[PDB]
Write a protein that binds this ligand. Structure first.
Ligand SMILES: Nc1nc(SCC(=O)NCCN2CCOCC2)nc2sc3c(c12)CCCC3
Ligand SMILES: Nc1nc(SCC(=O)NCCN2CCOCC2)nc2sc3c(c12)CCCC3
Ligand SMILES: Nc1nc(SCC(=O)NCCN2CCOCC2)nc2sc3c(c12)CCCC3
Ligand SMILES: Nc1nc(SCC(=O)NCCN2CCOCC2)nc2sc3c(c12)CCCC3
Ligand code: NA
Ligand code: NA
Ligand code: NA
Ligand code: NA
Ligand code: NA
Ligand code: NA
Ligand code: NA
Ligand code: NA
Ligand code: NA
Ligand code: NA
Ligand code: NA
Ligand code: NA
Lengths: 396, 396, 396, 396
């Protein structure tokens, strides 16, 4: 039980453990694409004296945070302990080694998608974005008088084969990810992967169609088993016009009873309809999780609300340092101090505040975030809040 | 088809229509209690040349709004058109008459709970609060190290018969409703009603139990059919200690698999657990709906965020007037003007902003709220936002 | 194991066997009402050397058959063999004794409702009417331009308590049963019974409401468990106006998703809607079963289609006699002959033809009805067919 | 938005719209077969200034109507409006153009299968045949003494691979379609298609088997998911012997719990069993829809019941002409008149009467068919009724 960087001879063993550990595993030939995003010394394996009983790696990602600021992000992925080697501290050992490497490489943040909601808090990760399934019963769906693009003349939305409009989707996604907190750069190899899953699989998923606007696209497919349900896999709109136009087109799928989509809590769709209730929230879950690797570097890099006035405090992160935090003009200055702390939180809590998805008041109500001054609580709420609402880019 | 105030001879006819129109109708003897909250000239009936084919009324309510300010509120209820008299403009006629009376009586706002989400927007009502069902699989539920009241010595929470601690529940609810936006004064007759539904019904609901803290209570009962589910009908906590203590007690119901509760989007419960995901959102729906009867009187009466600086604009409400709105020091001054409008919205949209549940940015994204200045949008978002998170009191 | 007419001392034993044999048993106090319809020597019990292990009886009924002709009918009911005395020929013995008594009393027909579809063919009973559940998704239901009573002014349909309009329901049902094949006289005691089941039972069925027209009524209640379903227990309309008006009222139950009713295959409801398919057939089953006790007396008593011309044939019923059958001017003459049979059928098959629900062609295709002349088959089809479509009155 | 006949360059665009509009779409290579049945100028597309946003076509069909008379029939199919171009009158425009072409080509009738039951009435189509799912619990199924082919010696039914007995199936279907109202000529290319779907698909449908009689065949396969259910896709029997023999074989599938089939309301199967109720009606829906293009040409072409005597009337079809209709000797003469109408109906209603599936009395009860003389109603019922019961051939 020694902890090493994998050699090329180790990957077949890692793919075996992946196949047994993740039910959604897309096989080795598809894993070559994602492997391009793993830097040299981005992966750790544990061997038993021999085969692979343990693995974890990070990918080089670019995360957009409030103020349209793009951070280098270590994306944690492909974490797996053999069923034969549980309760043996292999995860603790692997996560520690990667965090060392992530820290020493100069990543201010790491991020992951959690398989369970109870594992990653202890390693410093906080849930930072919220996933939100909306299901529209589109038979009753009528658009409000106030809704855009409900006038005579032509539609701007086209129905198209995804594979023949890759360039337009890239262009739109690139505009989208740069201006939305939670946005991730989607490299070429992940566009290759995304469009290979657009085509119909024998006894698998059905053909994916696209609705294409100058400033938006929606990829959808009819469900395998439920043939009256369209699953919107991905809708990216840069303008409210594009968003609305795309939903007029989706509500126009007259052979479907229900359109479903995984979106964000602030999706304006419910307000496009004469009946808000027709867009039911069927499902809600933690999206992206953040570990703030370097507190001063992260707090300084993001923009803050211009609306709150200048204010200063001392933030203590448990075993992560104490800081004089001065916020004003939507910039922050974060500097070492030994002054008495006014606000205390574990590092995972800072992850949950960092993109604006969670309010400091809420975490304080749970005593995850201690302060004796509620004026300071309101000011943190206001400053950390995001003007553009926070969204989840793509699962990794 | 003439529209009149009911006489005592009209109520049996109204109770007949109620029994046929609402499946949850609690019968005449229980309707005597609610009738005490209907003012003289609070009810309209439509007769056909004869029996009651139409009815609507308002109750005298006291609604808490941001800044711990209590408004007189006309609560719209008991609205029903005979199945024999649909598509005949009886609702339009009845709602118009009540709104006339509500306006001329000096109510700044009316409120209702909607049976459908598509009827009430056209009459000026906006969804103002969000209901949120959390279901905890309590078998996996462990409280976080940071959570309050996890130390040795005694528990402060007692298990009790609801009927023998009415005074303590009243006291706690009275403290709660005065300090929470969406709070409603619960009069004596509704406490009589609430505790009569605490006892077990033959072949109906099971006995209700209470968890009692100095600063909180929870009423729960095991589900009729699912005997591994506890339904928390009502949890009122005044302090974070009370909230946490009550959930330790609820998670301690070792014979249940699932605790469910209808709460608000900012409920801190998910953050009390080591696994946020164990508190699943199973259901989400519009709660209280607001019609702003008098725009200047309502906008002036509520508190605003101290965090946003002083700012002025011209608000047009469609067919509801145009106003110079000046917000600063968490007060608003709202005065008539004929100056060019900077912000336009239908009256229902103002209802949805009024308690802070919905962001102006979100409604703007849906074009329910028109402005050409996004700086003004951020300022409205910030000013209208509620420091204490908005909650739904009781259904009427 | 001797077969006797019950004494008053035998009924408690019969009620015990009834409670164990029929899950829907309405108890002894309610069985006093139905007992009034059992004639002296209408009931047989089997005792074991002692308690009741066997029972069967007939009730005095008046059945309407084609040509608005009302026949005295022995209604077979309350048939039960102890679970302790199966496969012992007690049913065969009891049915034989009752049929003897029914025959010798001068009933031309007996009728029953079957608990199973496989028992009663061998005793000479044929399924004579078809039950047909229609379920309307009333959210999509719009009436056709051509539909009656879709013009301005008042509705003629009232919503009422069943118990306060007994006289009007009786009057309408009495008009209905006299003019519809399958109609049964409903005596006073069965109107007492029907209205006692209109009221809500503690942890049972909900309150029943009535829609009342001068020429029609509908009794409905919301389902116990499914609160979005209205079950129409009974709709009697004498004119197409009444039928349509009542369905406009039922489709107006805006709190229901689905209206369900057990009706007949020729119910015009599907054709009242712009979308026939909205009235789905969810369920279909044999209704009333007929045993022709006296072939000549029954064939002579009913009217025949005036459209088919005069024609003669020889009908053989297996072990039920051979007859010269002459049909013309919608009358039949049925006389003994020893002439060669042109048409053969078991007696149960004649029951199935007798009210016009089943076509002779269909039964011939199944070889239940033998002839070597298809011209004669078409003529039987045409003559036996009912101008007024055949309906099921009430279960007994 | 111009309306044109498609060029060969337009089909890829039509196949894209087909894939997105119909979930059952069988792909382009299979659509080449059906394309052979589309005449020159049988198809219309709508382009947007460019891609295909609209399409509709008719196929050359031969429909059997009562009196074993075969009509040329325009079969409407492949109708689709882009989700991006709803509520724009593209369907109205396309249907109008095709009906013009269908009329001017000399088709007396058009027919279609409806995706929804609410679209096609306004374009003059009436539901003309009824689909009827029977499900047999074959564990309890015993054949009646009277049933054919229940004697000793050999069975005449063989179990066979469909692909090796194509000639025998063709021969039987050809005999069947010529003698049954609703019958359609099945051309070579549709037999190619039918037998390609007989073989097992990887992770799709299972292998199809055939039961083969000299005068009948049944194609069945075990259900994908439910392995105790045999789905009879198609049973064609020319003689009652063949029908019965085939069901003895199907009830002999001792590894199945349930045999299901989509058949017609007059299927004699229920009467083959000792228990009629074992053949439950699980599902019922409109089959083939008819638009009478030329009222006199259609009314004159079909046979009428010989049983009803000679009679004359004036039929008005709304915006379809008024006619002196004289029916006798099972022929009709239909001639222009300006005499007062005795019977009025919309054109769709005539479609519903034309094959005998619906009774004029029933449509009159719904006021779809106005007359002041009920004697004339009985005579129309009798004359339009079909001696051979009406069946649905194959979906298109
Ligand atoms: N990061 C990756 N993601 C995917 S599919 C996107 C997705 O939604 N994953 C959720 C579930 N995961 C499944 C797999 O990783 C853990 C949990 N596929 C591959 S192959 C592969 C990676 C990789 C990492 C780099 C090495 C080889
Ligand atoms: N306002 C009232 N509320 C209740 S129960 C609380 C509740 O949750 N109602 C939701 C459904 N409603 C059911 C009834 O009113 C409409 C929809 N019960 C009565 S009796 C009664 C009222 C009344 C108004 C005053 C007159 C007589
Ligand atoms: N004929 C009767 N009918 C009813 S309820 C109508 C009904 O729907 N019955 C269907 C099921 N049956 C249940 C009971 O009889 C067999 C199957 N209730 C009583 S008490 C009673 C009878 C009687 C006969 C006369 C003697 C005492
Ligand atoms: N007429 C056709 N039918 C079939 S499959 C038989 C079937 O059951 N269709 C029901 C659903 N339809 C699905 C497709 O057409 C609308 C609704 N497949 C093709 S490819 C094709 C046609 C065609 C028309 C000619 C042009 C190309
Ligand atoms: Na980015
Ligand atoms: Na969206
Ligand atoms: Na963190
Ligand atoms: Na209050
Ligand atoms: Na709570
Ligand atoms: Na409002
Ligand atoms: Na009668
Ligand atoms: Na009916
Ligand atoms: Na009989
Ligand atoms: Na044909
Ligand atoms: Na069949
Ligand atoms: Na027609």
């Amino acid at each position: 039980v020694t902890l090493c960087s994998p050699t090329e001879d180790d990957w077949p063993g890692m793919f075996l453990l992946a196949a047994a550990s993740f039910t959604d595993f897309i096989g080795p030939e598809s894993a070559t694409a994602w492997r391009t995003l793993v830097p040299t010394d981005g992966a750790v394996v544990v061997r038993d004296g021999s085969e692979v009983v343990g693995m974890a790696l990070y990918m080089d990602l670019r995360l957009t945070v409030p103020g349209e600021v793009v951070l280098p992000t270590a994306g944690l992925s492909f974490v797996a302990v053999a069923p034969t080697h549980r309760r043996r501290g292999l995860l603790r050992a692997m996560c520690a080694e990667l965090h060392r490497r992530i820290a020493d490489s100069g990543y201010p943040v790491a991020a992951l998608h959690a398989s369970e909601g109870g594992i990653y808090g202890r390693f410093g990760y906080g849930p930072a974005t919220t996933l939100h399934e909306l299901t529209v019963d589109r038979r009753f769906a009528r658009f409000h008088a106030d809704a855009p693009g409900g006038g005579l003349g032509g539609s701007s939305v086209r129905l198209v084969r995804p594979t023949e409009h890759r360039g337009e989707f890239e262009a739109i996604y690139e505009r989208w990810r740069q201006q939305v907190p939670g946005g991730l750069l989607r490299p070429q190899v992940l566009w290759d992967e995304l469009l290979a899953e657009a085509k119909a699989a024998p006894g698998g998923d059905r053909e994916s169609f696209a609705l294409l606007h100058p400033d938006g696209y929606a990829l959808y497919r009819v469900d395998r088993t439920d043939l009256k349900l369209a699953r919107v896999s991905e809708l990216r709109a840069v303008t409210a016009d594009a968003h609305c136009a795309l939903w007029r087109a989706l509500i126009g799928l007259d052979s479907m009873e229900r359109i479903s989509i995984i979106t964000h809590p602030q999706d304006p769709l419910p307000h496009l309809l004469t009946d808000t209730r027709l867009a039911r929230t069927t499902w809600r879950q933690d999206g992206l999780w953040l570990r703030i690797m370097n507190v001063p570097a992260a707090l300084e890099a993001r923009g803050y609300a211009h609306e709150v006035g200048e204010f200063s405090t001392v933030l203590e992160v448990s075993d992560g340092g104490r800081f004089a935090l001065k916020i004003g003009d939507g910039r922050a200055r974060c500097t070492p101090t030994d002054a008495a702390a006014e606000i205390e939180m574990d590092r995972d809590v800072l992850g949950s505040l960092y993109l604006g998805a969670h309010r400091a008041s809420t975490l304080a109500a749970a005593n995850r975030l201690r302060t004796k001054d509620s004026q300071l609580l309101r000011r943190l709420d206001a400053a950390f809040a995001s003007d553009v609402p926070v969204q989840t880019a793509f699962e990794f």
